[PDB]
Amino acid sequence: IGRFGTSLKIGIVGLPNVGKSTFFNVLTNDPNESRVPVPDERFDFLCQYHKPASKIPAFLNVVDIAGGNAFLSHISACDGIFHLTRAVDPIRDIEIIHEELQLKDEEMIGPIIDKLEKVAKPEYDIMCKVKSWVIDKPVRFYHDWNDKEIEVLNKHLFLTSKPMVYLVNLSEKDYIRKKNKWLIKIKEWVDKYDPGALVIPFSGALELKLQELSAEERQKYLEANMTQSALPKIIKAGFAALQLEYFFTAGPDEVRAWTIRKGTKAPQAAGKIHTDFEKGFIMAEVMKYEDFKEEGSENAVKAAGKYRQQGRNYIVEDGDIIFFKFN
Ligand SMILES: Nc1ncnc2c1ncn2[C@@H]1O[C@H](COP(=O)(O)OP(=O)(O)CP(=O)(O)O)[C@@H](O)[C@H]1O
Numbered sequence: 001i002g003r004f005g006t007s008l009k010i011g012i013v014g015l016p017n018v019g020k021s022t023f024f025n026v027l028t029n030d031p032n033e034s035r036v037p038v039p040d041e042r043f044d045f046l047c048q049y050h051k052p053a054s055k056i057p058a059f060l061n062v063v064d065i066a067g068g069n070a071f072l073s074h075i076s077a078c079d080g081i082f083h084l085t086r087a088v089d090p091i092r093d094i095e096i097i098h099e100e101l102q103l104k105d106e107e108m109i110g111p112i113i114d115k116l117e118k119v120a121k122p123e124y125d126i127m128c129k130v131k132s133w134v135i136d137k138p139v140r141f142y143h144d145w146n147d148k149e150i151e152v153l154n155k156h157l158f159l160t161s162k163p164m165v166y167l168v169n170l171s172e173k174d175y176i177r178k179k180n181k182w183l184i185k186i187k188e189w190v191d192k193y194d195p196g197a198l199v200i201p202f203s204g205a206l207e208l209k210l211q212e213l214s215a216e217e218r219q220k221y222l223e224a225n226m227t228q229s230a231l232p233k234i235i236k237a238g239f240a241a242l243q244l245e246y247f248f249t250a251g252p253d254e255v256r257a258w259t260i261r262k263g264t265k266a267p268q269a270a271g272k273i274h275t276d277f278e279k280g281f282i283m284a285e286v287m288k289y290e291d292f293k294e295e296g297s298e299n300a301v302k303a304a305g306k307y308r309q310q311g312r313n314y315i316v317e318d319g320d321i322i323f324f325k326f327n
Contacts, residue, residue, distance in 0.1 A: 011078035
């Protein structure tokens, strides 16, 4: 479903006084959006290996909804939801936020019947299907769709068609000691009512102390308490939820993550670098990260028969290290 292309955004969503600003602040460290580097082990490896002038990873765009009803205006203006949540208290809360979003959808589906009711034509067929489904359920819970259906769906970008990742905000203590009444029940719920949904705990407090403390004391802190920042796992969760991923260009001058959508084929992949490449492109030279690491160098990868040469019909895969060729 969703918008076309790679210019997506994920939105920070939940009730007030639940850590939104903190959560936003920590990511940062436009005042309502920020781009955050995605952390990646591969990237680091490639970068250490080539020691390039220029290092450029992928980024997540995250929106700290400032502006409900106007609130939902901005949600429709995002491509998925970071459902933030505090730790009855968080389950009532989850049911609420789901309630609003489902109700904003029916409320918009109304006129979409009205205006369509004069059959001048095949679209009318499918909107019923949707309404029928959204007078039960969220759009996304229907894992069966088609080209005709997605077209129409994408016309209105319903709130319940956006994907969702649950973030449970916690006291320093519960994250660290790794047990919390609510996370159990939330996970119970998510399994019952949103199967597959990611639930990721974290502590805004904790994360913010870590911003303040010196990389030295910082490390002493994370050593002492046998714990980790939760952020990297959340940034990746967001990116993954947007259906984004990337490929690499590594060489002595630059290593770079190039964000793409699942299914992007090599010519559109190359067009990210320069738009003449979508047409101008005869093949892509691909090395999987695994092989480059194992074999230990490009000539080793080549010598071992693993430096594959894909044509114009190749779906780039996440992690591919690619030299694109033209003319
Ligand atoms: N796990 C936790 N530990 C300590 N303090 C916490 C906490 N979760 C939230 N808080 C506190 O709540 C206060 C307000 O948090 P924050 O501004 O991030 O929430 P919010 O953005 O939902 C308020 P608003 O609704 O005005 O945007 C902060 O000063 C923060 O210390």
